[PDB]
């Protein structure tokens, strides 16, 4: 039961008790994915409106 | 996601529509002159979902009244809450539709539809954030069925990213006006499968049996039938009109209820079932509300839920009651009858509780089921359709309006596909 | 002094945020108008509470916080409520329509339209900082915004603030209070996309909190208000070391170094005690040994799981109130002979302990009794993977039939993302198994 | 009405257990993937312990103790017997000890005559949710039909008096009485109570019970040597009806009431 690194201040204290020792996408990439999803929405709506026009 | 635009078309559509507004005006404390007189702010919290604010604290239904003849709308204008509707929102022709889908969809209805869209557009444009649309109509006549679905198609074209919701009355021979009702219904379902996000299947067959057997009415009238409809409509829109967590807007409801786009046809139910001028003295318990709302004899689609499985269910409890009890009873039903709820959609039953009970009741519950058994309704319509179509009977009424036989064949095959698609998940 | 910005996303994130800040104000002696009598420095300072609060010339103490939601109704309650004066309007950000419980809708469709505004509002707070440590992000897994917009925001934060640490407080979905059938989808989708952007994530299962409110607070049917007050106690005890003078977990980075050896395995289990009903007229005041033993009871954990059948990588005990190191060590020593505590072989078997003399503050008229001592244990154990197994299974059931998938594809998300996300979770579950299981 | 699921079709023991429950009339068997159950008769490998006890409105139970594989895996058994403080001490009853375990061979055993044949002892041990230890009053002596060839093994893959090469306890007593009621009870509770803190579902959200098959080998001096524990044992015929009914009696019904032949260690 070794206690290491005891630190005390007026607000409280902290320490460590050891029982036993051991044995990203860029901005442009993000805009690209967002725009690809937007375009698929656009395409899907376009196909719907095409159907309705028929 | 606040404003809803309400549309009511044809005779059945306008008559149930009028009752809907009558009932929810009372619940929100709106008088027949459009002024508020309630004792709770819960009434006004979300009133903008169905009502516009005018001048002098006047509330006006965001409602559009459509018909191809003036009769039913003259009657509405004379009704108890007739003067609450905006005068300019009455749109009507003179010729009628003769119980003919083609006249509502292709000829007579086409002449009137732009003017309806003008009124729809005006309502939509002054919406802070339009949720979508709610349409009341029957499938068995000509205006509500043919022009109703024409409108839906036109609306989807201008407002493609909005939710389309319908209360659709299904015809039945037990309460029939004309023999062509299966033709009109089959043509309509075709439209509904493609162009609505959610349809409440209100079956005149089930409404009749409930009035006759359960409510012991020897001679049910359309009035008795509409009493059941307006109570159900109040119940299923409760989560949209009052503060709450679950299914609080049209799109969240669809996301919770519709796992596959075409399968969006709901079996509604209500408890306690009551006749007009009913005594209604003993309030029901939570276990009583719960057992009754789940009971097949209580469903308003004339299908047996016991023959199928629920994809999804929404339950709404109204009145002051114990939420602990409600949670217990809802878990009880599912745990004791787990086979009736598809295991591949975990926790597919969602419960809401609103403090404010409907008029005349201390406690009620509204059921909304997406059951594979709903195929029985479409199979029934398909049978009646086919008995006539095999002999080309009464087709001349439709070909005379420019329609071809092949459009009937196509409509019939699409409804058969729907039945097949429900059947494939009934055993999966 | 180094600053921390808090970010609350969606209803869950926002409502928990409000509970936390109310509590922070009570703990630091700050009134709803922002005035703080205790603070001798006016219009400035570099005290420990200045990591969460900035100051104006009028002596107003303003939270370094941003609230974001895609519909206005939840944040409207902040704008009009008790602590309306606390925040300035530009912190409180709302859109018009929500993500409808749809990750794709909050991430792709609506997220694209509001992300730049949110980031610029965040830059506004950041430019007020002399040394920004990073961000604390509060959100649900199940909501369209909490899941969809948060993962987008995290991605852009890694870009705009590459050095800064990011911590999550995440609400894991529970059917007893859930509002959507597709919550398992949103959970897996958001976890996949956020994984590489989050340094340490504190996961809270609503089921656990719900049952703790039922069994320990005698609340029949817990509301969000009940849940959030409990949650904000646990959050407070976790963030206290950044807000008060001390030497343990004093910066965001230290959370990772102390709790997270393997970057992907960054989900510490929180366990709290005691939770005592304010309604009891006779409180049996718990000792240090007692509240410390409670930390090893599944019943007190933020996620129900069994740490006996997993391995510990790290353990931190955070005490508030009348507690001395001697009694902690005596307690740890007893517990070691009565509990199944197995650490991974490449880590020391031990505890980092922090004590703050101020006993937990409670909200007046709340459900929580004031106690003389409390403890929150943070332990990176592989057992929390049980929560991923449960989630992954529900996902598997629906996805096999493609139930509800069309709602996501219709928002412009590709079906492949579903399987890319499930694979990441499959690997994540495999990583825990390698670390925690031996054969 | 109680509900349960079967996730291991091949269990001969729990096929009867399932057979017994349905016959009660107050048990409905569910699809394997239905989570709304009271009882789980689980798969042998990678049982989803993490998914139990998270169903509101349902007390759940499983027919396996998570972590008992430390006892029931030979390689695991050796480490546990060697490393654990209370089990390693006193351990005079364990022979000195893919992946393999080579362990000290008993030079000469007890030998029944006629035959000069070898045999082993399998006892059945049921542990319930309260962590009571329930030995089965009937044990099975699996025999080799061939004379000891200093045959070496009695596994059915490997019958003049012994029918199916099974001597049924009572006869053994008489042989002990002709040719020549402790060490077995001490061994069972030594192993299981050792692992108690690690596997007990005392205050868990779900509960466990498990059937174990303890295999024994006895020697010249009538000292009993334990060879391994079986996590998924099968019963001997004629003992199935009795044993399985007891499992229902004490491990299932005891938690799920309707409307002895175990010695409690
Ligand atoms: C659970 C979904 C559901 C399926 C079933 C089978 C459910 C189960 C239970 O309700 C939840 C039955 C229920 O517990 C009762 C026994 C009280 C009761 O209501 O059962 C019905 C008959 C029953 O079908 C036999 C019913 O029609 C029904 O639908 O039952 C008579 C009724 O007279 C007052 C009463 O005796 C379909 O939505
Ligand atoms: N603990 C807790 N959970 C909440 C709270 N509010 C919502 N939740 C949970 O959060 C999950 C998702 O809901 P929300 O956060 O409300 O959804 P959202 O982020 O606003 O996303 P959208 O409304 O779809 O745009 C559900 O599982 C709820 O149970 C809350 O105040 N406290
Ligand atoms: N130390 C020893 N002394 C004498 N015989 C031994 C022995 N170790 C093994 N044997 C003989 O070999 C047999 C091997 O059976 P073992 O228990 O190793 O595998 P098994 O076939 O029973 C698989 P299971 O785990 O399902 O029981 C022993 O029961 C015994 O007959
Ligand atoms: N429930 C109900 N059904 C009606 C009502 N009026 C008509 N129906 C049904 O509606 C169908 C006839 O359509 P209808 O609305 O009268 O024709 P339309 O004016 O051309 O739309 C038939 O199935 C009738 O049974 C009503 O007031 N209530
Ligand atoms: Ca200061
Ligand atoms: Mg008519
Ligand atoms: Mg929201």
Write the layout of secondary structure elements.
This is part of a larger assembly, with chains A (54 residues), B (428 residues), C (439 residues) and D (265 residues).
Chain A: E1 2-9, E2 12-20, H1 27-53
Antiparallel strand pairs in A: 1-2
Chain C: E1 3-9, H1 10-28, E2 53-55, E3 61-63, E4 65-69, H2 73-80, E5 92-94, H3 103-109, H4 111-126, E6 132-140, H5 144-160, E7 165-172, H6 183-194, E8 200-205, H7 206-217, H8 224-243, H9 252-259, E9 269-273, H10 288-293, E10 312-321, H11 325-335, E11 349-356, E12 373-381, H12 385-400, H13 405-409, H14 415-436
Parallel strand pairs in C: 1-4, 1-6, 4-5, 6-7, 7-8, 10-11
Antiparallel strand pairs in C: 2-3, 9-12, 10-12
Chain D: E1 2-6, H1 12-24, E2 27-30, E3 39-41, E4 61-62, H2 69-72, H3 74-83, H4 85-88, E5 117-127, E6 133-136, E7 140-147, E8 166-167, H5 170-178, H6 183-194, H7 196-199, E9 207-208, E10 210-218, E11 224-230, H8 240-252, E12 262-264
Parallel strand pairs in D: 1-2, 1-3, 3-4, 4-9
Antiparallel strand pairs in D: 5-6, 5-7, 5-10, 6-12, 7-8, 10-11
One magnesium ion (MG) is lined by residues 11, 141, 177 of chain B.
Please provide a written account of the structure.
It is classed as cell cycle/inhibitor. This is part of a larger assembly, with chains A (54 residues), B (428 residues), C (439 residues) and D (265 residues). With 54 residues, chain A is an alpha+beta fold. Chain A contains 1 helix and 2 strands, in the order ββα. Chain A has one helix at residues 27-53; strands spanning 2-9, 12-20. By secondary structure, chain B is an alpha/beta fold. Helices cover 43% and strands 17% of the residues of chain B. Chain B has helices at residues 10-27, 71-78, 101-105, 108-125, 143-158, 181-195, 204-214, 222-236, 238-241, 250-257, 286-294, 323-336, 375-389, 396-399, 405-426, and strands spanning 4-9, 51-53, 59-61, 63-67, 90-92, 132-138, 163-170, 198-203, 265-271, 310-319, 349-354, 363-371. In chain B, the strands form 2 sheets. Chain B has a 10-stranded mixed sheet with strand order 5-4-1-6-7-8-9-12-10-11, with helices on both faces. In chain B, strands 2-3 form a two-stranded antiparallel ribbon. The relative contact order of chain B is 0.12. Chain D is α/β, with parallel strands linked by helices. Chain D has 2 domains: 1-53, Rossmann fold, CATH 3.40.50; 54-95 and 108-265, 2-Layer Sandwich (D-amino Acid Aminotransferase, Chain A, domain 1). In chain D, 26% of the residues lie in helices and 23% in strands. Chain D is built from 8 helices and 12 strands. Chain D has helices at residues 12-24, 69-72, 74-83, 85-88, 170-178, 183-194, 196-199, 240-252; strands at 2-6, 27-30, 39-41, 61-62, 117-127, 133-136, 140-147, 166-167, 207-208, 210-218, 224-230, 262-264. The longest helix of chain D is centred in the first third of the chain and has 13 residues, at 12-24. The two termini of chain D are 32 Å apart. Classes of the chains: A alpha+beta (54), B alpha/beta (428), C alpha/beta (439), D alpha/beta (265). Chains in contact: A-B, A-C, B-C, B-D, C-D. The structure holds Peloruside A, guanosine-5'-triphosphate (GTP), phosphomethylphosphonic acid adenylate ester, guanosine-5'-diphosphate (GDP), calcium ion (CA) and magnesium ion (2 copies).
